[PDB]
Amino acid sequence: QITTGSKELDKLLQGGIETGSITEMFGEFRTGKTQICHTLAVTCQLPIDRGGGEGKAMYIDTEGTFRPERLLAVAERYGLSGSDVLDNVAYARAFNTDHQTQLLYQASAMMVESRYALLIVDSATALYRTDYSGRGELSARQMHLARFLRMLLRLADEFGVAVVITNQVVGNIIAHASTTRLYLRKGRGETRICKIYDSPCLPEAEAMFAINADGVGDAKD
Amino acid sequence: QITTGSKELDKLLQGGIETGSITEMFGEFRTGKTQICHTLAVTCQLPIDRGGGEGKAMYIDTEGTFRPERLLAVAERYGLSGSDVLDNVAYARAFNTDHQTQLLYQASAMMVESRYALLIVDSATALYRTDYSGRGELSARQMHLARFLRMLLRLADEFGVAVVITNQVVGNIIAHASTTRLYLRKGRGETRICKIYDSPCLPEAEAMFAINADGVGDAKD
Amino acid sequence: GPQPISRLEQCGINANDVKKLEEAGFHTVEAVAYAPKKELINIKGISEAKADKILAEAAKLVQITTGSKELDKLLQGGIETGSITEMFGEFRTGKTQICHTLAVTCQLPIDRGGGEGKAMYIDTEGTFRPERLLAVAERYGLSGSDVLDNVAYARAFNTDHQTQLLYQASAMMVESRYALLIVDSATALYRTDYSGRGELSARQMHLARFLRMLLRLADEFGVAVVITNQVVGNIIAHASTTRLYLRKGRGETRICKIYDSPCLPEAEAMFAINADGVGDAKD
């Protein structure tokens, strides 16, 4: 279980993300999805006794929001070398859905040589809306997403890594792929509310957390 | 005969599922189909004198409700090694009907190298409803389902394993193919009513059981 | 009596159209004759000219014990043979159990409340259990094997197959004396097969024709026609002579009510479902 770095969120998840499964966080823009991704990109490298996976991180960005400086802040938070964190995080921006799926072919071969623990796909559904904007092409983007999800699940079962994809809620296909769905909503200022909206094992429940310069971290009124 | 782990249910089945035949359990959502599947996935590995088949398990999931931790709970219930149970259960999620049937080709070759005793297909009919949703395409999903069932029967007769498929009731072709039809309905709280609705050999009869953290297990008022 | 439709072919209807009428379920010249044009026109492969030739040439030629004493008293002695008796009730009320009991009691001597005739069980729901027939046979001291030998069974896979079995039933019922025809979940296949809303008139037409065939067979062979309806149709009301409403009393004891009969009173009787039998309630 990879620690979220919010204790309340860890309790909500019973200790953190299950590696080897897809966890979906759906919420409005600016809710902190990207911040949570950046935090996990470093916490995954933490020792297992500290709530990490002791593995490298993979950030596939589709929205431009990738910030190595946020990774440095999280690394200094947990007392990890920021330079080694950036050296253990391979980054690439997907320009389209086809490029988004094509990066998985390189990911599968690259993930064999080194131990990784986290794969991040940020605005995973945005490219299926910007690229495929017509109505007759909806089935095509659904097929491409289905294939993308199958490759993700295969890599997850193959390498035992955590698969994190982000969805903006301004599809039913994601339901089957994600194991745990988390709903994020804004509390004013920088403090965010997290809710569990489906889990066969985890209760429906809520936890309050904040977004701090160092971290994604518990709410401190 | 693979023990259900509910004594009353074992009596209902005259000792448990017949291996080498398809047993269908149709019921509403949340009736416990998935829980029974998870329980059987472990009980199959139990000794034959304990109601098992002394074989490995195969879980083909279509609904996302698969929890290895539930398998661990069932294993600790019967005093089986949870880690060895997970090592003796090969699992794969079918995203659609074509992938669901395609997994049987890998299953037939893989089932030759190791002894298996149970094949589970959970929400087996759900993908035929989500994929084929139109009315003109009904014959296509019926043909695909027919071929899938024939492959299941062939594999059952070939390897002598138990074939378990789950059906959500929100086809008449399955009637001839399934040997034992079980109707599941909710009793309030966590206690479920089971009824036998066709068997040429087993009586039409009912048994009350409960869903417990460890197990699918007899009702204990 | 009947005027089997074979004679219609000698009037000069071609034999293929007579075969289409038999497939549709019309087996007598009486059957084709007293129906309007639209019934024959709706049959596949029949034009208006063939229907007019058929109607024109056709006009030229043309108590079984329930085994519950209280229920027998409710019915004044048992089912009238030669008529349709409908028992509508909730699921698990014992409709199938009553069917299994009657399937054996029909073979009982008339002095014992039987019809001294063989039974016909058409199942659509899988609930057919020969062991229940064996239990009823041993209850009345009848050979269970001979009971099963005097009960012909067939599972209908669809509505068309449900009606198609009547074609074999009519010809088979001529060689041997039968007394009871059972159709269990008779309306279930009209709900599972015809599930859409635009196809409702089609299932209603098929059901109407099926019911007319039931009445025709009842008047032809003087046998009892028993059909079961699950109430989770008003057309059966005019066709059925006696409507029985079944409801559950808790445990295994069931309440029976008569909900229409021009001759039988509206009244109620309590009965139970016992391993041997459908049999009177014994608190």
XYZ file of C-alpha atoms in Angstrom:
725
model
C 0.000 0.000 0.000
C 1.576 3.240 -1.224
C 1.034 6.011 1.323
C -0.924 9.006 0.064
C 0.947 11.107 2.625
C -2.355 12.246 4.076
C -2.871 10.100 7.174
C -6.644 10.584 7.025
C -6.580 9.573 3.361
C -4.400 6.559 4.189
C -6.999 5.516 6.771
C -9.696 6.086 4.159
C -7.786 3.723 1.853
C -6.787 1.442 4.776
C -3.152 2.460 4.385
C -2.782 3.601 0.792
C -3.178 2.538 -2.810
C -3.075 -1.174 -3.514
C -0.267 -1.817 -5.963
C -1.243 -3.985 -8.911
C -4.639 -2.318 -9.394
C -6.130 0.786 -11.002
C -7.292 3.569 -8.666
C -9.404 6.316 -10.236
C -9.712 9.801 -8.709
C -12.509 11.737 -10.412
C -13.080 15.358 -9.451
C -13.388 18.895 -10.720
C -10.438 20.832 -12.080
C -8.113 22.350 -9.458
C -9.232 19.764 -6.874
C -5.629 18.567 -6.553
C -5.546 15.462 -8.761
C -2.215 16.583 -10.231
C -0.893 17.445 -6.765
C -1.820 13.969 -5.497
C -0.062 12.457 -8.516
C 3.104 14.478 -7.853
C 3.046 13.466 -4.184
C 2.609 9.772 -4.962
C 5.378 9.989 -7.578
C 7.793 10.479 -4.680
C 6.072 8.579 -1.867
C 6.164 5.423 -4.004
C 9.948 5.547 -3.604
C 9.574 5.593 0.195
C 10.416 2.434 2.148
C 7.570 -0.052 2.480
C 7.730 0.425 6.253
C 7.082 4.138 5.593
C 4.096 3.432 3.352
C 5.986 3.351 0.053
C 6.580 0.684 -2.548
C 10.370 1.076 -2.798
C 10.079 1.520 -6.540
C 10.568 4.144 -9.199
C 7.738 6.281 -10.563
C 6.374 6.809 -14.072
C 4.530 10.002 -14.990
C 2.808 10.127 -18.374
C 1.437 13.648 -18.722
C -1.229 14.801 -21.162
C -2.058 18.210 -19.679
C 1.311 19.964 -19.203
C 0.970 20.102 -15.406
C 4.145 18.101 -14.688
C 6.387 19.966 -12.239
C 9.744 18.480 -11.168
C 9.905 21.170 -8.483
C 6.816 19.679 -6.835
C 8.646 16.342 -6.815
C 11.617 18.070 -5.180
C 9.314 19.535 -2.527
C 7.793 16.126 -1.786
C 11.259 14.541 -1.658
C 12.487 17.133 0.844
C 9.258 16.625 2.815
C 10.015 12.933 3.377
C 13.752 13.616 3.488
C 14.404 11.996 0.110
C 17.018 13.199 -2.354
C 15.158 15.380 -4.838
C 17.759 14.683 -7.511
C 17.436 10.924 -7.077
C 13.650 11.275 -7.186
C 13.858 13.052 -10.532
C 16.405 10.447 -11.656
C 13.960 7.668 -10.703
C 10.996 9.297 -12.462
C 10.810 8.981 -16.237
C 8.553 11.573 -17.827
C 6.920 11.966 -21.218
C 4.026 14.086 -22.438
C 1.479 12.326 -24.638
C 0.313 14.502 -27.516
C -2.674 12.365 -28.534
C -4.545 9.172 -27.721
C -2.498 7.167 -30.221
C 0.701 8.572 -28.728
C -0.741 7.893 -25.270
C -1.164 4.208 -26.089
C 2.118 4.054 -28.019
C 4.071 5.095 -24.937
C 2.855 1.911 -23.201
C 4.810 -0.224 -25.666
C 8.015 1.509 -24.573
C 6.804 1.357 -20.969
C 6.445 -2.425 -21.014
C 9.995 -3.004 -22.242
C 11.508 -0.316 -19.996
C 9.658 -1.588 -16.878
C 11.360 -4.995 -17.232
C 14.917 -3.737 -16.681
C 14.203 -1.623 -13.576
C 11.802 -1.956 -10.663
C 8.995 0.587 -10.827
C 6.080 0.998 -8.440
C 3.869 3.755 -9.883
C 2.543 4.695 -13.328
C 0.768 8.059 -13.579
C -1.478 9.116 -16.472
C -2.754 12.642 -15.834
C -5.845 13.867 -17.694
C -6.062 10.322 -19.067
C -9.535 11.019 -20.488
C -8.782 14.531 -21.777
C -7.150 13.344 -25.004
C -10.179 11.200 -25.840
C -12.289 14.379 -25.730
C -9.900 16.753 -27.498
C -8.810 14.297 -30.207
C -12.107 12.450 -30.758
C -14.629 15.289 -30.733
C -17.144 13.972 -33.261
C -20.123 11.763 -32.514
C -19.634 9.025 -35.104
C -16.093 8.455 -33.801
C -17.168 7.778 -30.206
C -16.898 3.997 -30.578
C -13.374 4.453 -31.949
C -12.140 6.353 -28.900
C -13.930 3.802 -26.709
C -12.062 0.987 -28.484
C -8.749 2.831 -28.128
C -9.401 3.446 -24.433
C -10.374 -0.206 -23.952
C -7.088 -1.325 -25.521
C -5.202 1.220 -23.405
C -6.862 -0.123 -20.249
C -6.106 -3.721 -21.217
C -2.440 -2.837 -21.645
C -2.495 -1.070 -18.267
C -4.058 -4.062 -16.507
C -1.605 -6.439 -18.187
C 1.368 -4.332 -17.085
C -0.099 -4.055 -13.575
C -0.457 -7.826 -13.240
C 2.945 -8.373 -14.870
C 5.067 -5.978 -12.801
C 2.889 -5.584 -9.704
C 2.966 -1.794 -10.050
C 0.283 0.737 -9.183
C -1.684 2.210 -12.094
C -3.015 5.727 -11.489
C -5.171 7.487 -14.073
C -6.905 10.829 -13.639
C -10.351 11.740 -14.937
C -11.808 15.240 -15.053
C -15.515 15.522 -14.258
C -16.711 18.856 -15.637
C -17.487 6.868 -19.061
C -18.814 3.491 -17.948
C -15.736 1.847 -19.481
C -13.523 3.215 -16.701
C -15.789 1.652 -14.054
C -14.628 -1.904 -14.777
C -10.988 -0.850 -14.996
C -10.707 1.188 -11.804
C -10.914 -0.838 -8.601
C -11.447 2.109 -6.237
C -13.194 5.337 -7.248
C -12.455 8.497 -5.266
C -14.495 11.680 -5.676
C -12.641 14.923 -5.030
C -14.369 18.224 -4.327
C -13.108 21.648 -3.333
C -13.265 23.118 0.115
C -12.490 26.796 -0.160
C -8.915 27.855 0.178
C -6.561 24.938 -0.517
C -8.328 22.231 1.516
C -10.017 19.374 -0.390
C -12.682 16.789 0.492
C -12.129 13.179 -0.611
C -14.937 10.617 -0.780
C -14.988 6.928 -1.681
C -17.769 6.410 -4.207
C -17.339 2.723 -4.985
C -15.313 -0.081 -3.505
C -16.438 -3.708 -3.069
C -14.032 -3.860 -0.096
C -13.620 -0.305 1.075
C -16.541 1.508 2.737
C -18.150 4.555 1.243
C -16.606 7.218 3.480
C -15.039 10.679 3.429
C -11.814 12.271 4.637
C -10.650 15.880 4.683
C -7.147 16.781 3.515
C -5.105 19.782 2.401
C -2.599 20.582 -0.333
C 0.605 21.918 1.231
C 3.802 23.075 -0.470
C 5.684 19.998 0.767
C 2.905 17.510 0.347
C -0.546 16.150 -0.094
C -1.215 16.087 3.593
C -3.944 16.031 6.180
C -6.214 19.021 6.702
C -5.067 21.223 9.609
C -7.760 23.842 10.279
C -18.019 -32.419 -5.445
C -16.583 -29.035 -4.462
C -17.864 -27.976 -1.042
C -19.734 -24.684 -0.969
C -18.579 -24.292 2.637
C -22.172 -23.789 3.717
C -23.320 -27.105 5.183
C -26.957 -26.313 4.381
C -25.919 -25.454 0.818
C -23.875 -28.664 0.591
C -27.003 -30.582 1.621
C -28.995 -28.593 -0.940
C -26.564 -29.747 -3.639
C -26.290 -33.241 -2.079
C -22.672 -32.510 -1.154
C -21.574 -29.751 -3.520
C -21.094 -28.795 -7.144
C -20.528 -31.635 -9.573
C -17.189 -31.094 -11.275
C -17.253 -31.544 -15.036
C -20.573 -29.722 -15.444
C -21.819 -26.138 -15.535
C -23.738 -24.875 -12.489
C -25.462 -21.513 -12.952
C -26.442 -19.255 -10.025
C -28.798 -16.484 -11.157
C -29.906 -13.802 -8.717
C -30.211 -10.094 -8.078
C -27.192 -7.897 -7.466
C -25.666 -8.084 -3.967
C -27.124 -11.573 -3.388
C -23.608 -12.967 -2.875
C -22.744 -14.578 -6.227
C -19.248 -13.069 -6.102
C -18.792 -14.081 -2.458
C -19.712 -17.687 -3.281
C -17.278 -17.585 -6.208
C -14.451 -16.328 -3.975
C -15.218 -19.021 -1.397
C -15.258 -21.814 -3.987
C -12.020 -20.458 -5.488
C -10.315 -21.586 -2.278
C -12.448 -24.563 -1.265
C -11.622 -26.223 -4.594
C -8.044 -26.520 -3.322
C -9.301 -28.289 -0.179
C -8.798 -32.057 0.076
C -11.517 -34.153 -1.537
C -12.307 -35.631 1.883
C -12.977 -32.038 3.003
C -15.269 -31.348 0.056
C -12.651 -29.955 -2.325
C -11.343 -31.012 -5.705
C -7.622 -30.848 -4.868
C -7.068 -28.540 -7.812
C -6.093 -24.988 -8.622
C -8.655 -22.276 -9.336
C -9.361 -20.044 -12.335
C -11.208 -16.760 -11.872
C -12.337 -14.938 -15.015
C -13.823 -11.659 -13.829
C -16.113 -9.376 -15.807
C -17.478 -7.089 -13.059
C -14.418 -5.886 -11.092
C -15.568 -7.384 -7.781
C -12.574 -9.739 -7.453
C -10.753 -9.402 -4.128
C -7.697 -11.597 -3.432
C -8.031 -10.584 0.211
C -11.387 -12.387 0.243
C -9.524 -15.460 -1.014
C -7.057 -14.977 1.839
C -9.948 -14.830 4.315
C -11.438 -18.043 2.932
C -8.006 -19.704 3.016
C -7.465 -18.768 6.667
C -11.007 -19.968 7.418
C -10.212 -23.483 6.162
C -6.621 -23.233 7.391
C -5.098 -22.937 3.917
C -2.030 -20.851 3.124
C -3.351 -17.588 1.701
C -0.135 -16.985 -0.222
C -0.220 -20.465 -1.744
C -3.894 -19.955 -2.587
C -3.029 -16.793 -4.498
C -0.132 -18.666 -6.116
C -2.522 -21.448 -7.210
C -5.218 -19.117 -8.588
C -4.655 -17.511 -11.978
C -6.864 -14.465 -12.440
C -7.801 -12.278 -15.401
C -10.497 -9.669 -16.006
C -12.417 -9.915 -19.261
C -13.192 -6.471 -20.645
C -15.602 -7.662 -23.354
C -17.178 -10.772 -24.863
C -14.441 -11.290 -27.465
C -11.741 -11.114 -24.797
C -13.858 -13.366 -22.572
C -13.928 -16.069 -25.238
C -10.304 -15.453 -26.262
C -9.116 -16.206 -22.735
C -10.444 -19.753 -23.153
C -7.816 -20.466 -25.819
C -5.042 -19.618 -23.360
C -6.983 -21.411 -20.613
C -7.125 -24.712 -22.496
C -3.364 -24.826 -23.061
C -2.563 -23.557 -19.545
C -4.944 -26.063 -17.874
C -2.897 -28.927 -19.352
C 0.330 -28.102 -17.487
C -1.240 -27.742 -14.014
C -4.210 -29.399 -12.338
C -7.179 -27.069 -11.979
C -10.586 -27.858 -10.515
C -12.695 -24.698 -10.883
C -13.286 -22.076 -13.584
C -15.234 -18.988 -12.491
C -16.806 -16.452 -14.857
C -18.414 -13.697 -12.787
C -21.073 -11.508 -14.417
C -20.659 -13.835 -17.407
C -23.728 -12.337 -19.098
C -22.985 -8.703 -18.198
C -20.486 -8.214 -21.027
C -23.039 -9.530 -23.529
C -25.347 -6.703 -22.393
C -22.770 -3.912 -22.201
C -21.061 -4.758 -25.499
C -24.123 -5.802 -27.528
C -26.732 -3.241 -26.483
C -28.621 -2.851 -29.765
C -31.562 -4.938 -30.919
C -30.360 -5.887 -34.406
C -27.106 -7.195 -32.902
C -28.870 -9.627 -30.541
C -28.234 -12.676 -32.739
C -24.510 -11.874 -32.743
C -24.214 -11.874 -28.951
C -26.379 -15.009 -28.788
C -24.036 -16.773 -31.228
C -20.989 -15.610 -29.263
C -22.560 -16.784 -25.993
C -23.502 -20.138 -27.542
C -19.930 -20.699 -28.725
C -18.600 -19.639 -25.316
C -20.895 -22.114 -23.545
C -19.933 -24.908 -25.944
C -16.255 -24.200 -25.259
C -17.003 -24.287 -21.522
C -18.760 -27.651 -21.813
C -15.914 -29.024 -23.935
C -13.316 -27.897 -21.387
C -15.437 -29.314 -18.551
C -15.628 -32.725 -20.204
C -11.941 -32.560 -21.164
C -10.393 -31.632 -17.796
C -13.175 -32.715 -15.428
C -13.263 -29.290 -13.786
C -16.241 -27.410 -12.376
C -17.614 -24.564 -14.501
C -19.257 -21.733 -12.548
C -20.878 -18.800 -14.362
C -22.874 -15.942 -12.838
C -25.919 -14.265 -14.395
C -27.464 -10.933 -13.405
C -31.265 -10.713 -13.471
C -32.219 -7.034 -13.583
C -31.121 -16.780 -22.335
C -33.159 -19.928 -22.930
C -30.140 -21.418 -24.745
C -28.273 -21.715 -21.429
C -31.060 -23.885 -19.973
C -30.008 -27.020 -21.869
C -26.331 -26.285 -21.141
C -26.448 -25.631 -17.383
C -27.008 -28.717 -15.235
C -28.032 -27.035 -11.962
C -29.846 -23.696 -11.703
C -29.709 -21.838 -8.383
C -31.850 -18.789 -7.637
C -30.379 -16.389 -5.097
C -32.391 -13.728 -3.295
C -31.594 -11.331 -0.482
C -32.749 -11.732 3.068
C -32.237 -8.481 4.906
C -28.974 -7.958 6.670
C -26.295 -10.250 5.252
C -28.297 -13.506 5.127
C -29.248 -14.922 1.704
C -31.891 -17.417 0.528
C -30.878 -20.060 -2.032
C -33.376 -22.064 -4.102
C -32.899 -24.830 -6.679
C -34.985 -24.070 -9.762
C -33.983 -26.932 -12.043
C -32.075 -30.155 -11.686
C -32.957 -33.480 -13.355
C -31.229 -35.162 -10.381
C -31.309 -32.643 -7.598
C -34.649 -31.771 -5.956
C -36.180 -28.348 -6.127
C -35.403 -27.178 -2.593
C -34.184 -24.199 -0.578
C -31.439 -23.510 1.949
C -30.628 -20.446 4.030
C -27.031 -19.227 4.287
C -25.004 -16.177 5.307
C -22.053 -14.186 3.980
C -19.362 -13.917 6.657
C -15.986 -12.177 6.493
C -14.177 -15.535 6.496
C -16.585 -17.420 4.310
C -19.721 -18.294 2.476
C -21.160 -20.092 5.428
C -24.305 -21.363 7.049
C -26.842 -18.933 8.461
C -26.357 -18.457 12.220
C -29.285 -16.439 13.591
C -67.614 -33.554 -32.610
C -64.551 -32.496 -34.590
C -64.266 -32.296 -38.371
C -60.508 -32.776 -38.885
C -59.008 -30.289 -41.316
C -57.880 -33.085 -43.654
C -61.357 -32.981 -45.242
C -60.770 -29.354 -46.187
C -58.072 -30.424 -48.628
C -60.615 -32.444 -50.615
C -62.555 -29.209 -51.101
C -59.574 -28.063 -53.201
C -57.490 -26.019 -50.828
C -53.972 -27.054 -51.759
C -52.277 -29.295 -49.209
C -49.489 -26.823 -48.434
C -51.997 -24.264 -47.153
C -53.643 -26.944 -45.013
C -50.231 -27.797 -43.588
C -49.727 -24.104 -42.835
C -53.068 -24.048 -41.020
C -52.096 -27.101 -38.971
C -48.760 -25.474 -38.123
C -50.781 -22.417 -37.081
C -52.850 -24.749 -34.925
C -56.134 -25.140 -36.797
C -56.951 -28.834 -37.057
C -60.670 -29.038 -37.890
C -63.006 -27.565 -40.481
C -64.959 -26.186 -37.521
C -61.746 -24.474 -36.437
C -61.028 -22.712 -39.732
C -64.708 -21.986 -40.386
C -65.795 -19.925 -37.350
C -62.983 -17.395 -37.426
C -62.779 -14.100 -39.353
C -60.499 -13.403 -42.317
C -57.676 -11.781 -40.384
C -56.724 -14.927 -38.476
C -55.911 -16.871 -41.629
C -54.411 -13.846 -43.380
C -51.994 -13.246 -40.494
C -50.530 -16.728 -41.033
C -47.231 -16.674 -42.917
C -47.530 -17.555 -46.591
C -51.289 -17.014 -46.919
C -52.842 -14.356 -49.152
C -56.404 -13.036 -49.106
C -57.392 -15.282 -52.020
C -56.282 -18.436 -50.219
C -58.048 -17.305 -47.052
C -61.284 -16.701 -48.937
C -61.014 -20.109 -50.598
C -60.480 -21.717 -47.196
C -63.405 -19.994 -45.499
C -65.683 -20.599 -48.488
C -64.939 -24.302 -48.762
C -64.968 -24.673 -44.958
C -68.501 -23.301 -44.762
C -69.517 -26.090 -47.146
C -68.361 -28.865 -44.798
C -69.395 -27.126 -41.570
C -64.687 -34.352 -12.249
C -60.984 -34.945 -11.606
C -60.292 -35.001 -7.868
C -57.915 -32.309 -6.651
C -56.937 -34.666 -3.826
C -57.790 -31.978 -1.302
C -61.235 -32.837 0.052
C -61.833 -29.208 1.023
C -60.787 -28.119 -2.472
C -63.078 -30.748 -4.010
C -65.931 -29.294 -1.943
C -64.926 -25.810 -3.102
C -65.253 -26.957 -6.733
C -68.354 -29.111 -5.997
C -66.358 -32.270 -6.719
C -63.474 -31.340 -9.010
C -62.502 -29.909 -12.370
C -65.045 -30.142 -15.157
C -63.474 -32.092 -17.996
C -63.898 -30.483 -21.401
C -63.300 -26.936 -20.130
C -60.382 -24.692 -19.192
C -59.815 -24.007 -15.483
C -57.282 -21.268 -14.723
C -55.415 -21.035 -11.403
C -53.740 -17.640 -11.046
C -51.641 -16.939 -7.984
C -48.333 -15.673 -6.725
C -45.093 -17.561 -7.171
C -44.377 -20.414 -4.725
C -48.107 -20.826 -3.971
C -48.062 -24.458 -5.140
C -49.428 -24.234 -8.698
C -46.791 -26.705 -9.903
C -47.500 -29.005 -6.944
C -51.222 -29.002 -7.779
C -50.341 -29.802 -11.398
C -48.167 -32.751 -10.345
C -50.936 -34.054 -8.075
C -53.625 -33.798 -10.754
C -51.287 -35.466 -13.267
C -51.677 -38.653 -11.225
C -55.173 -38.258 -9.778
C -56.581 -38.008 -13.315
C -55.626 -41.667 -13.784
C -57.624 -42.625 -10.683
C -60.968 -44.373 -11.217
C -63.925 -42.064 -11.746
C -65.463 -43.539 -8.598
C -62.261 -42.384 -6.854
C -62.508 -38.884 -8.312
C -60.444 -39.532 -11.439
C -61.184 -39.430 -15.141
C -59.729 -42.850 -15.974
C -57.500 -41.275 -18.594
C -53.847 -40.583 -19.235
C -52.148 -37.265 -18.461
C -50.264 -34.721 -20.577
C -47.693 -32.423 -18.975
C -46.311 -29.582 -21.108
C -43.625 -27.795 -19.093
C -42.133 -24.384 -19.851
C -40.385 -23.652 -16.534
C -38.293 -26.750 -15.706
C -40.227 -27.544 -12.512
C -41.328 -30.996 -13.701
C -40.444 -33.657 -11.128
C -41.316 -37.305 -11.857
C -40.636 -38.061 -8.188
C -43.606 -35.889 -7.177
C -45.716 -37.983 -9.548
C -44.306 -41.105 -7.897
C -45.226 -39.717 -4.472
C -48.787 -38.986 -5.574
C -49.046 -42.450 -7.140
C -47.888 -44.146 -3.937
C -50.294 -41.951 -1.957
C -53.304 -43.333 -3.849
C -51.604 -46.715 -4.241
C -50.976 -46.371 -7.979
C -47.924 -47.744 -9.750
C -45.534 -44.814 -10.043
C -43.909 -46.347 -13.104
C -47.271 -46.813 -14.814
C -48.201 -43.255 -13.837
C -45.073 -41.986 -15.567
C -45.943 -44.278 -18.487
C -49.378 -42.626 -18.694
C -47.909 -39.112 -18.475
C -46.287 -37.727 -21.614
C -43.894 -34.872 -20.931
C -42.254 -32.258 -23.126
C -40.528 -28.957 -22.394
C -41.486 -26.032 -24.615
C -38.497 -23.882 -25.528
C -40.519 -20.975 -26.959
C -44.077 -19.864 -27.705
C -43.975 -21.302 -31.227
C -42.726 -24.614 -29.822
C -45.383 -24.418 -27.098
C -48.091 -24.223 -29.748
C -46.282 -26.727 -31.990
C -46.439 -29.401 -29.295
C -50.230 -29.232 -29.573
C -50.002 -30.584 -33.124
C -48.299 -33.739 -31.880
C -50.662 -33.800 -28.893
C -53.817 -33.762 -31.025
C -52.725 -36.684 -33.204
C -51.293 -38.639 -30.255
C -54.454 -38.067 -28.149
C -56.505 -39.913 -30.790
C -54.813 -43.300 -30.331
C -55.045 -43.348 -26.514
C -57.557 -41.943 -24.042
C -56.210 -38.963 -22.123
C -57.931 -36.940 -19.423
C -55.583 -34.088 -18.476
C -53.373 -31.602 -20.330
C -51.077 -29.464 -18.155
C -49.278 -26.326 -19.368
C -47.097 -24.939 -16.576
C -45.946 -21.315 -16.778
C -48.165 -21.096 -19.866
C -47.813 -17.301 -19.886
C -44.113 -17.213 -18.957
C -42.889 -17.900 -22.492
C -45.057 -15.067 -23.807
C -43.139 -12.734 -21.468
C -39.621 -14.110 -21.980
C -39.871 -14.463 -25.772
C -41.956 -11.353 -26.511
C -40.282 -8.849 -24.192
C -40.613 -5.689 -26.281
C -43.519 -3.259 -26.277
C -44.156 -3.036 -30.020
C -44.410 -6.839 -30.142
C -47.177 -7.012 -27.511
C -49.962 -7.445 -30.074
C -48.043 -10.364 -31.590
C -47.842 -12.284 -28.316
C -51.493 -11.440 -27.627
C -52.495 -12.892 -31.008
C -50.376 -16.000 -30.414
C -51.852 -16.423 -26.928
C -55.389 -15.972 -28.278
C -54.799 -18.664 -30.896
C -53.224 -20.933 -28.270
C -56.234 -20.517 -25.958
C -58.634 -21.195 -28.826
C -56.677 -24.373 -29.588
C -56.943 -25.361 -25.921
C -60.725 -24.920 -25.933
C -60.956 -26.813 -29.241
C -58.922 -29.735 -27.876
C -61.011 -29.734 -24.685
C -64.253 -29.971 -26.653
C -62.708 -32.501 -29.057
C -61.279 -35.031 -26.600
C -63.322 -34.173 -23.501
C -60.124 -33.740 -21.507
C -59.354 -31.224 -18.779
C -57.162 -28.292 -19.832
C -55.021 -26.814 -17.049
C -52.845 -23.756 -17.672
C -50.808 -21.843 -15.104
C -50.358 -18.071 -14.973
C -47.820 -16.164 -12.886
C -49.038 -12.895 -11.373
C -45.976 -10.838 -10.457
C -54.403 -11.823 -18.783
C -57.984 -10.630 -19.161
C -58.264 -12.563 -22.442
C -58.311 -15.865 -20.538
C -61.259 -14.677 -18.419
C -63.871 -15.184 -21.142
C -62.146 -18.440 -22.154
C -61.579 -19.918 -18.696
C -64.705 -21.151 -16.932
C -63.331 -21.231 -13.373
C -60.669 -18.863 -12.039
C -58.881 -19.842 -8.829
C -56.726 -17.392 -6.890
C -53.921 -18.957 -4.880
C -52.104 -17.169 -2.078
C -49.507 -18.252 0.444
C -50.176 -18.970 4.066
C -46.892 -19.103 5.907
C -45.157 -22.414 6.169
C -46.384 -24.797 3.471
C -50.144 -24.212 3.836
C -51.953 -22.358 1.019
C -55.234 -20.435 0.764
C -57.427 -21.009 -2.302
C -60.179 -18.627 -3.405
C -62.625 -18.788 -6.305
C -62.546 -15.439 -8.093
C -64.952 -16.100 -10.929
C -67.362 -18.870 -11.716
C -70.849 -18.455 -13.205
C -71.731 -21.693 -11.362
C -69.345 -21.958 -8.479
C -69.694 -19.534 -5.554
C -66.990 -17.115 -4.606
C -65.622 -19.017 -1.619
C -62.361 -20.054 0.019
C -60.750 -23.300 1.134
C -57.526 -24.002 3.004
C -55.148 -26.755 1.870
C -51.555 -27.902 2.355
C -48.695 -29.194 0.215
C -47.475 -32.527 1.612
C -44.718 -34.814 0.346
C -47.265 -37.390 -0.850
C -49.874 -34.996 -2.111
C -51.742 -31.796 -2.557
C -53.899 -32.481 0.425
C -56.135 -30.930 3.018
C -54.715 -28.655 5.692
C -54.097 -30.493 8.985
C -53.126 -27.943 11.652
